[PDB]
Amino acid sequence: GVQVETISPGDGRTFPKRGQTCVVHYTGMLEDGKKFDSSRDRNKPFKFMLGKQEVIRGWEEGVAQMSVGQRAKLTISPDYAYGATGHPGIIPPHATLVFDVELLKLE
Numbered sequence: 595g596v597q598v599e600t601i602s603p604g605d606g607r608t609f610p611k612r613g614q615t616c617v618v619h620y621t622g623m624l625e626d627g628k629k630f631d632s633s634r635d636r637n638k639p640f641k642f643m644l645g646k647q648e649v650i651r652g653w654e655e656g657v658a659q660m661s662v663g664q665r666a667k668l669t670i671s672p673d674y675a676y677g678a679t680g681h682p683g684i685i686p687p688h689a690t691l692v693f694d695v696e697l698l699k700l701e
């Protein structure tokens with residue numbers, strides 16, 4: 595599944611509604627802690643509609659629990675990410691992923 599641990603608390607009241615656009619900055623790391631991709635490296639946040647399956651299950655459930663301004667660590671089992679296949683060229687097969695995600699705004 596996906597486990598969430600807060601790095602910096604959010605407002606504790608503004609949570610995403612289903613289908614709402616979540617604007618985030620994230621850094622994804624493999625289990626050895628090495629970054630494989632980060633929106634911060636592009637200086638542009640990443641956006642997705644909660645529950646529209648634009649992101650892995652780990653994010654769909656992990657970000658659902660977060661509030662605006664919160665920055666948290668999401669640890670995601672492979673089956674909640676890319677499973678046995680992984681994603682060629684960046685994420686190996688059977689990879690547990692750890693993301694540092696900051697929910698910046700809800701539109």
Ligand SMILES: Cc1ccc(S(=O)(=O)N2CCSC[C@H]2C(=O)N[C@@H](CC(C)C)C(=O)O)cc1
Pocket residue numbers: 620622631640648649650653681684
């Ligand atoms: C090629 C690539 C680059 C970054 C990542 S990630 O940071 O893990 N990454 C993008 C940040 S959202 C969390 C996850 C994801 O859900 N990606 C989307 C679109 C991606 C694939 C464009 C998907 O799996 O459909 C996965 C795969």
